[PDB]
Amino acid sequence: LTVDQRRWEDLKSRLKIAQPLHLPPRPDNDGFRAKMYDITQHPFFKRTI
Amino acid sequence: LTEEQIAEFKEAFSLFTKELGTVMRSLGQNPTEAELQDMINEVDFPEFLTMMARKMKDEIREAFRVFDKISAAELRHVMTNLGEKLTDEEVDEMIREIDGDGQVNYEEFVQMMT
Amino acid sequence: QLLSYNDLRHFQIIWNMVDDKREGVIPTFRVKFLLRLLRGRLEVDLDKDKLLFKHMCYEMERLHNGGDVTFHDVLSMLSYRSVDIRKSLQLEELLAREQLEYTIEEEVAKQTIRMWLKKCLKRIRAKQQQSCSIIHSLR
Amino acid sequence: NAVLKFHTLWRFRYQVWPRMEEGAQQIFKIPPPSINFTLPSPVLGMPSVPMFDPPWVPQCNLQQEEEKKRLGREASLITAIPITQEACYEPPPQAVFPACICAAVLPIVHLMEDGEVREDGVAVSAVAQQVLWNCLIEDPSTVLRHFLEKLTISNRQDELMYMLRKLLLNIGDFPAQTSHILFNYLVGLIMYFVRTPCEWGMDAISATLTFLWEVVGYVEGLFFKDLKQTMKKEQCEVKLLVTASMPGTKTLVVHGQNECDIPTQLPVHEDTQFEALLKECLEFFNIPESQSTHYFLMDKRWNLIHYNKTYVRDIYPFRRSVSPQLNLVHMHPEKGQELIQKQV
C-alpha cells in the first residue's frame, strides 16, 4: 500500500471509532442553568482545573 | 446570514416578536405582523427551518447542465423509462414537438415549461 | 490532505446542533441542513458548488431509500468526498466509488428532467382527456 | 477506366475545399451526412489491432529480444492497415464525397466478378478488388454510410445483405476495422428499428440477423461480458442474445372494434398464451360463437398479428410503466392465417 492508502485506511478506522459528542445542549428555560453551563464550559475554567 | 435560510436562522434566532421582520424582508416578503408570532410559535432552529423551507417551496443553468448527452431515439427511451404512467401516446407528440432535426434544445423546453 | 480532528470536532458540533435529541439519526430531508451549516474547511460554496451539493444530498438520500441516516453514514460520505479518491483508494474500491458517483450524477440529472416531464405530461394529459371527453360526446 | 476514375475521385476528395473561394463553406452549401444511428456505447469491439513494431513510431538477454521481436513482427498483417495514413505525422480537413458517388460502390462490387482481361493483361476484377480493398481499409465509414442510411428510408434490407455477402465472399475477408464498424453499425440499426416503429422493422431485423453471424467472426476483442453489459444498457439484448432474461409485462391493454370504446386491462402471467387472452376478449366483447374465427389480436404500432399459441411474455419482455396496446381486429380467417404464417 502507498502511504496515502495507509493514511486513508487509518482515517477510516478513526471515523469508525468516532462517536457523537456527549455534551448535551445548554438549557435555556432558566437563566440559572444557562449561566452555569456558560461558566462551566469556559476554557479558562478547564485550564485552571 | 445569506439569501438561503440555513445560515440566516443561526443569526435570526440568536441575534434577535416583530424585529425578525428585518430578516424576513430580505426575502422580499412582508406578511402580517401577527404572523411573526405564528412562526415564533415554533419555539427552535430546526422547527423554524422545517416550517419556512416548505413555505418557500410553497433556472437555465440547470437545463444547460443536464444537456450532458440528444437524438430522437435517445430522448424517446430515456423519457419513457423515466416517466410515469404515460401510454406512449404523448411521446409521438414530443418527438414531433421545432427544427425537426431530431435534436432538442432545453432552453426552449424551459420556455415551454409555462 | 485528510479529514483532521478539528474538522471532526466541528462536524460533531454541527451534528449536535441539527440533531435536537441525542438519538444519533436524522430523517434524510434534514441532511441538507447539515451540509450547508457546516463551516470552515468543510464548507461548500452554494454560489459555485450547486451541482456538488445536490449530488451529496441525493447520495445521502439513496444510501437508504427514504431512510433515516446515521452520523456514521454522513461522516463516511464527507470523508470519501474530501479526498482525491484516485490516490487514496484501492483499485476495486476506487472503481466502486467512481461508478457510484457516475450513477448518482446521471440519476440526479434525469431526476431534474422528470419534473419537466411531469409538468408537460400534466398539460398533454389534460388536453388529451378533454379530447377523449369530446369523442365520448361523439358517441 | 471507370473503376480507376472512381479511385482517383476517392484519393482526391480531401483537396476540394482549398481549391475554391476562401470561406466558401458558408457561401456554398453541401447538406450534412444524415445519421440517425446511435452506435452502442461503449463501442462493442476493438477499433483496430496495432502493428507490433511499427517502423514509423519513434519510441524504441538480447538474442531473446530479437527472437521475440521477429516472431511478433511475423504475426502482424502489414497489408491490412493504411500504411501511409498511419505513417504520416500528426500536427480540419473536410471530405466532399456526395451520396451519388457512393452508389458507384455496388457496380464495382459486381465488377469484382468480371473476368475479362485487357490486352495489357490487366483484369477488371483485380483492379476492382484492389480499389475496394484500399477504400475499405482506409475509411469504411464513408463507403458504408450511404447504404446504412439508405436502408432506414426504404425496405431494401435484402439487397443490402446480398451486396455485403458478395463483397465478403469476393474479398474473402474483413480487416479488423471494417468488421468493427460494420458490426457496430448493424447493431445500431437493430436497436434503432427496435425503438422506432416502422412498417418493415422486424423484417429488417431478421435480414440483419441472417448475416450478422458472418461479420461476428472477424471482430477481434468481442467478449461475452462486454456484449452483455452493452446490450443490457441499451435495453435490446433480447433481440441479439438467446441467453437473455427479461421479466415480461404484468398486464396488457386491448382495444375493441370501435374508437375510444372502453378497453380491457387484462393480467399476464408467466405461462399465459394469446389464446386465453383472446378468449377473454371475446367473452368481454359479446361476440357470437358463429363469428368467433374472424377476430385476431394484433399490435397496430408494430404491425404484428399474434399467433394463438405463442407466450405473451415472450413478445413483450419489457416491463415498463406502459403496457402494450393491442387491438381486436376482425378479418377473414384465411388472410389472418396467412399473416400469422408469414410473421412466425
Cell numbers for C137: 360526446
To 10 degrees, what angle do helices C50-62 and C71-81 make? Answer: 140
- Look at A23 and C76 and tell me if their CB atoms are within 8 Å: no
The listed CATH number (1.10.150.20, 1.10.3720.10, 2.60.40.420, 1.10.238.10) that belongs to domain B59-113: 1.10.238.10
| Interface B:C, ≥3 CB–CB pairs < 8 Å | yes
At which residue does the C-alpha cell 430578516 appear? Answer: B23
- Look at A4 and C12 and tell me if their CB atoms are within 8 Å: no
At which residue does the C-alpha cell 374465427 appear? Answer: D293
Let me know: does C105 contact B74? Beta carbons within 8 Å: no
- Look at C121 and B90 and tell me if their CB atoms are within 8 Å: yes
Let me know: does D102 contact D112? Beta carbons within 8 Å: no
Q: How far is CA D338 from CA A15, B70, D305, D307, D330, in A?
A: 71, 41, 10, 11, 14
Cα(B22)–Cα(B15) distance, rounded to whole angstroms?
A: 12
Cis peptide before D42 (omega within 30 of 0): yes
Nearest to B67 by CA among D197, D343, C113, C128: C113
Cell numbers for D158: 435484402
Let me know: does D304 contact D315? Beta carbons within 8 Å: yes
Residues in chain C within 8 Å Cβ distance of D42: none
Q: Which residue of C has its CA nearest to D262?
A: C136
Cα(C78)–Cα(B35) distance, rounded to whole angstroms?
A: 38
To 10 degrees, what angle do helices D176-195 and D124-138 make? Answer: 70
- B65 touches C at CB < 8 Å: yes
Would you tell me which residues 50-109 of chain C have a C-beta closer than 8 angstroms to some C-beta of chain B?
A: 50-51, 106, 109
Nearest to D303 by CA among D332, D340, D264: D340
At which residue does the C-alpha cell 464495382 appear? Answer: D108
Residues in chain B within 8 Å Cβ distance of C50: 61
- Pairing verdict, β D325-330 and D251-255: parallel
DSSP letter string over A1-49? Answer: --HHHHHHHHHHHHHHH-----PPPPP-SSHHHHHHHHHHT-HHHHHH-
- Pairing verdict, β D325-330 and D304-305: unpaired
- Look at D259 and C135 and tell me if their CB atoms are within 8 Å: yes
Instruction: Give me the sign of the Cα torsion angle D265, D269, D274, D276.
Output: negative
Cα(D293)–Cα(D330) distance, rounded to whole angstroms?
A: 9
Let me know: does C51 contact B75? Beta carbons within 8 Å: no
Cα(D11)–Cα(D101) distance, rounded to whole angstroms?
A: 13
D299 DSSP β-pair partners: D304
**C-alpha C86, offset from chain centre:** 22
Nearest to D326 by CA among D286, D283, D291, D296: D296
Geometric angle at alpha carbon B97, from B96 and B103, rounded to 5°:
80
Method of determination is cryo-EM
**From the CB of residue D66, how many other CB atoms can be counted at a distance below 10 Å?**
9
Q: How many helices (H) does chain B have, and how many strands (E)?
A: 8, 0
Non-local (6+) Cβ contacts of D322 within 8 A are: B80, B85, B86, B87, B88
Quick one: DSSP state of residue B105? -
- Look at B73 and D196 and tell me if their CB atoms are within 8 Å: yes
At which residue does the C-alpha cell 416517466 appear? Answer: B83
Cβ neighbourhood burial of C20 (10 Å; 0-12, 13-18, 19+)? middle
Cα(D254)–Cα(C72) distance, rounded to whole angstroms?
A: 52
Let me know: does D307 contact D344? Beta carbons within 8 Å: yes
- Pairing verdict, β D251-255 and C68-70: unpaired
Cα-flanking dihedrals φ and ψ of residue C77, to 5°? -65, -50
Q: Rg for chain B (alpha carbons), in Å?
A: 22
Work out the minimum CA distance from D36 to partner chain B, whole angstroms.
8
Let me know: does B11 contact B48? Beta carbons within 8 Å: no
Cell numbers for D111: 465488377
At which residue does the C-alpha cell 476517392 appear? Answer: D10
Instruction: Beginning with the edge strand found earlier in the chain, give each strand of the sheet holding D264-267 in spatial order.
Output: D264-267, D251-255, D325-330, D295-299, D304-305
Cα(D131)–Cα(D10) distance, rounded to whole angstroms?
A: 9
* Residues tagged in the binding site annotation of B for Ca(2+): 19, 47, 68, 74, 99, 101, 103, 108
Cα(D226)–Cα(D218) distance, rounded to whole angstroms?
A: 17
- B112 touches C at CB < 8 Å: yes
All CATH 1.10.238.10 domain ranges in chain B, comma separated:
2-58, 59-113
* Residues tagged in the binding site annotation of B: 19, 47, 68, 74, 99, 101, 103, 108
At which residue does the C-alpha cell 482515517 appear? Answer: A11
Nearest to D236 by CA among B35, B73, A35: B73
Cα(D187)–Cα(D190) distance, rounded to whole angstroms?
A: 5
Nearest to C114 by CA among C63, C66, C74, C58: C58
Work out the minimum CA distance from B64 to partner chain D, whole angstroms.
22
SS3 state of residue C41: helix
Nearest to D223 by CA among D29, D51, D43, D50: D43
Cα(D188)–Cα(D40) distance, rounded to whole angstroms?
A: 6
| Interface C:D, ≥3 CB–CB pairs < 8 Å | yes
Report the Cα–Cα distance between both ends of chain C, in Å, rounded.
73
- D41 touches B at CB < 8 Å: no
**What are the DSSP E strand ranges found in chain C?**
25-27, 68-70
The H or E element that residue B59 is part of is: none
Cα-flanking dihedrals φ and ψ of residue B49, to 5°? -60, -50
CATH architecture of B2-58: Orthogonal Bundle (1.10)
**From the CB of residue D208, how many other CB atoms can be counted at a distance below 10 Å?**
22
At which residue does the C-alpha cell 416491463 appear? Answer: D319
User: What single letter denotes the amino acid at residue B58?
Assistant: D
Interruptions in chain B after residues (C–N over 2.5 Å): 16, 43, 58, 69, 97
Cα(B63)–Cα(C128) distance, rounded to whole angstroms?
A: 27
Non-local (6+) Cβ contacts of D316 within 8 A are: D248, D249, D252, D268, D324
Cβ neighbourhood burial of C45 (10 Å; 0-12, 13-18, 19+)? exposed
> Burial letters for D33-44: b for 16+ Cβ neighbours within 10 Å, e otherwise?
eebbbbbbeeeb
> Burial letters for D293-304: b for 16+ Cβ neighbours within 10 Å, e otherwise?
eebbbbbeeebb
Let me know: does C78 contact C11? Beta carbons within 8 Å: yes
Non-local (6+) Cβ contacts of D150 within 8 A are: D156
**C-alpha C67, offset from chain centre:** 13
Let me know: does D136 contact D178? Beta carbons within 8 Å: yes
Nearest to C98 by CA among C67, C78, C90: C90
At which residue does the C-alpha cell 416578503 appear? Answer: B29
Cα(B7)–Cα(B13) distance, rounded to whole angstroms?
A: 11
Q: Please list the alpha-helical segments (H only) found in B14-71.
A: 21-24, 35-40, 45-57, 60-64
- Look at D235 and B77 and tell me if their CB atoms are within 8 Å: yes
To 10 degrees, what angle do helices D124-138 and D2-11 make? Answer: 20
Report the Cα–Cα distance between both ends of chain A, in Å, rounded.
44
Let me know: does B3 contact C34? Beta carbons within 8 Å: no
Residues in chain C within 8 Å Cβ distance of B46: 18, 20, 30, 33
Geometric angle at alpha carbon D75, from D73 and D79, rounded to 5°:
85
Region at C13 (left for phi over 0; alpha for psi -120 to 50; beta for the rest): alpha
* Secondary structure of chain D in HEC code, one letter for each residue: CHHHHHHHHHHCCCCCHHHCCCCHHHHCCCCCCCCCCCCCCCCCCCCCCCCCCCCCCCCCCHHHHHHHHHHHHHCCCHHHCCHHHHHCCCCCCCCCCCHHHHCCHHHHHHHCCCCCECCCCCEHHHHHHHHHHHHHHHCHHHHHHHHHHHHHHCCCHHHHHHHHHHHHHHHCCCCHHHHHHHHHHHHHHHHHHHHCCCCCHHHHHHHHHHHHHHHHCCCCCCCHHHHHHHHHHHCCCCCCCCCCCCCCCCEEEEECCCCCCCCEEEECCCCCEHHHHHHHHHHHHCCCHHHCCCEEEEECCCCEECCCCCEHHHHCCCCCCCCCEEEEEECCHHHHHHHHHHHC
Cα(B89)–Cα(B82) distance, rounded to whole angstroms?
A: 15
D251 DSSP β-pair partners: D267
Residues in chain C within 8 Å Cβ distance of B66: 109, 112-113
Non-local (6+) Cβ contacts of B18 within 8 A are: B33, B36
Task: Kindly state the greatest CA–CA separation across chain C.
Answer: 75
At which residue does the C-alpha cell 437555465 appear? Answer: B60
Cα(D54)–Cα(D45) distance, rounded to whole angstroms?
A: 22
